[PDB]
Design a protein around this ligand. Structure first.
Ligand SMILES: CC(C)(C)c1ccc(NC(=O)NCCCNC[C@H]2O[C@@H](n3cc(Br)c4c(N)ncnc43)[C@H](O)[C@@H]2O)cc1
Length: 326
């Protein structure tokens, strides 16, 4: 019963892999997960990087010597920390690079049968990462991913921000089931690397439900991957966003209002009367399954647009101009 073990850099239980090393899917396997874990612990601790592809992933002896050599170096770093050298700060957030590794790792150990999940169908990782940098978030914020799937986006944002809470809501059974495991695997692996995350919850639910009406209303940052949603769903979401508070934000893959919205007597009731909508800077090189470069849209709840329209109706000069155009 042959095995490979990697020690945690902060003394959690070791990662143990059987030999021969499992394959996770067409592009991922345990051997590369091991190599990349070592790579990433080395980025996490430069003394280790100091001490550390001429390796044969199909040879037990070659892979055992890699793991033994990492494990020795870890022991020696733990000794160094007992001395005068300061240990690695705990309670930090993972870098974007490490987080990407962690999420792949969590996925590798959580979604055993990809196929079961495919029948409900991560360049998104980079897009979300850009959004985390642009959309400033604080501990006043509540975050939701509407239609969260197996939960990856919620995990990523929770690892990276100070929002008071992060939620994902998913209706379908397969993805909700896998999210429970993703959650367990995520907490285990974040502990393994010694890294912190903000609070989060993954839930089974319908975000168009009556419970979610009030919850949407109290959320300050919503992400929603709506490009492929149909008009009735989008229409129903527009109605839930109408109760959001001023400064609330929605980031989506298809805008919920025209980018050039001109308020007038016929469109007074439209969601565009209460939000600024902008097309966000796209990430060079990122392209959708449609071939085009990706785009995403930021909506900010701003009721001063509506206020100014009403004020303008009181001004006979402005009222005439408006009336003459339309
Ligand atoms: C814009 C940026 C780039 C920032 C951005 C990038 C990514 C994200 N977020 C994600 O990709 N999340 C995971 C994949 C999308 N989820 C599809 C899931 O929706 C579920 N769903 C549908 C209804 Br309709 C639905 C519902 N009514 N109630 C609950 N779940 C629902 C459906 O069962 C699928 O499992 C958000 C923003």
């Amino acid at each position: 019963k042959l095995e490979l073990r990697l020690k945690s850099p902060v003394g959690a239980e070791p990662a143990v892999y059987p030999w021969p090393l499992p394959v996770y899917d067409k592009h991922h396997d345990a051997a590369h997960e091991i190599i990349e874990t070592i790579r990433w612990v080395c980025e996490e601790i430069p003394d280790l990087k100091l001490a550390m592809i001429d390796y044969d992933t199909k040879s037990f002896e070659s892979m055992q010597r890699l793991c033994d050599k990492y494990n020795r170096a870890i022991d020696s770093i733990h000794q160094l920390w007992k001395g005068t050298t300061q240990p690695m700060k705990l309670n930090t957030r993972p870098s974007t690079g490490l987080l990407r590794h962690i999420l792949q790792q969590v996925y590798n150990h959580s979604v055993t049968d990809p196929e079961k999940l495919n029948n409900y169908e991560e360049t998104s990782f980079d897009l979300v990462a850009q959004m985390i940098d642009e959309i400033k978030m604080t501990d006043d914020d509540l975050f939701v991913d509407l239609g969260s799937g197996v939960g990856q986006v919620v995990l990523q944002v929770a690892a990276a921000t100070n929002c008071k809470h992060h939620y994902g809501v998913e209706k379908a059974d397969i993805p909700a089931k896998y999210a429970e495991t993703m959650d367990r695997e995520f907490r285990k692996w974040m502990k393994w690397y010694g890294k912190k995350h903000a609070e989060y919850t993954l839930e089974r639910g319908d975000f168009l439900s009556e419970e979610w009406r009030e919850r949407i209303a109290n959320t300050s940052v919503i992400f929603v991957n709506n490009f492929a949603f149909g008009p009735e769903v989008d229409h129903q979401l527009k109605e839930r966003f109408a109760n959001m508070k001023e400064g609330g934000r929605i980031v989506s893959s298809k805008p919920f209002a025209p980018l050039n919205f001109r308020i007038n007597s016929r469109n007074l009731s439209d969601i565009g009367t209460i939000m600024r909508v902008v097309e966000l800077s796209p990430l060079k090189g990122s392209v959708s399954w449609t071939g085009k470069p990706v785009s995403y849209y930021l909506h900010t709840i701003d009721r001063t647009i509506l206020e100014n329209y009403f004020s303008s109706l009181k001004n006979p000069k402005l009222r005439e101009e408006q009336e003459a155009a339309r």
